[PDB]
Amino acid sequence: LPLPICKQLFTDRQRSWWDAVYSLITKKALPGTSAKLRSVIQHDLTTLRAQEKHGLQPAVLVNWARGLHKTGYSLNSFYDQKEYMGRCVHYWKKLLPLLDLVKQKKSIPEPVDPLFKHFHNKDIKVSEVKDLEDEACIAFATLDLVDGKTEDAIIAFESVKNVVAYWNLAL
Amino acid sequence: LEELAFDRQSKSGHLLLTLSHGKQNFISEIIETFANQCGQSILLKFLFEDNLSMQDSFMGSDDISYVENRVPDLSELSQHDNGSLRIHNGDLQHLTWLGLQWHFLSTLPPLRKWLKQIFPRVPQETSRLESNIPESICLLDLEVFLLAVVQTSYLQLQDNNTTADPNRPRCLPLPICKQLFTDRQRSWWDAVYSLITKKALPGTSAKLRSVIQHDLTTLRAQEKHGLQPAVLVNWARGLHKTGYSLNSFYDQKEYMGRCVHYWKKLLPLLDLVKQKKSIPEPVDPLFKHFHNKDIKVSEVKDLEDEACIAFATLDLVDGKTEDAIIAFESVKNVVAYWNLAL
């Protein structure tokens, strides 16, 4: 729907985090509130960086890694490609231990108040785990290619045996 | 006939530059002295003694008086060299001889252009430097091979020339020039050439792959490579100069990436030299060790600084401009200040 008649698209916690970041970076924060704003930011920044006990649903990490891979691959700047691929690979490395839990049919821990709501219709199926492991390996090989380790990248792509890996090998 | 003409012009032009010893008026002095009927009669006597008369000889009846005072141009010679490669079909003796001619001129041989002409289907670089599979060979593996062959041939010519006549040409013409490379270097190059060009005899391909796989570990500086440090320095320098001269971002990145790879393999050997430890020499090395080029403890710092410059240049080519600035500011050398200014 149009913005005036569209319901709130985000949670009050997502609002409180974004408004705290915006107010701190733009220096628009009210005098004396800056300590409270820093505490709100510091708490939920651990979640965004997938630090210990982040409580993220795996489907969010997959979407971040894919979004960053596509954006990074479309950039003509070596330094920008390296930063986006480096951050894409970071989320894949945080996702792999959760895919092992899904393969073991173990439940993923859900926070009582999550920064991003869990949607059970997007829970990763045991059948999709292999394709995501192969996609993680492709992203690792692409980072080694962007780092100029062409030989390590060739060996890594040859190991995945997928159309996307053959395309990168051809290139 | 056009390929023969390119071969003649390449060979004759490099030999004119070799025979002049850098004397500016040398071609003019020769024309005045010998480009006449008396000079022809002297040439005939040197070649055939009294067996042929001036009338019974092609040389004696030919007109040599219309000779231009033309010094061979280096840009024209580079074009003629690219033509000559078609007739020799990637012969290692021919490639090493041309590489030595350019090395005696203090100029880097255009090995990249030559290798693209001989091996048009081979990728420039590989993402799998840790692989020793023969099918993983890239143009940069062939370029470092040729750079080391040319350097080892040059050192072998110097050590043999310390007692030679000052008028002796630094490099002899190909027909009378001794083998510039070892039979192992031959066996490796001919195996690579035969495998890539699909000219290998039926049933020999397994043996050729084993020869390639063994010595490819040496070229990539894998575990126990047995290379002399001076060869790694020459590769890193050659690749740095070639890569810096290229206008293509992707080519610069591949050459700088491979340059940095050899510097990273050299640093632990420089630590051994600093500790006054001997470097392990193989019983049968792909590249001979020359003790006159062993790295001195005094030169280790300048090579550590050169390695740091090459790392900062790779971070600059990767678009990490801030990391490159910090790295160049740390070296405190004229080359680093020049890169900072740029």
UniProtKB/TrEMBL annotation, chain A:
Transmembrane segments: none annotated. It is found in: Nucleus membrane; Nucleus, Nuclear pore complex. Belongs to the NUP153 family. This is Nuclear pore complex protein Nup153. The gene is ranbp2.L.
TrEMBL record, chain B:
It comes from the Eukaryota. Signal peptide: none annotated. It is found in: Nucleus membrane; Nucleus, Nuclear pore complex. Belongs to the NUP153 family. This is Nuclear pore complex protein Nup153.
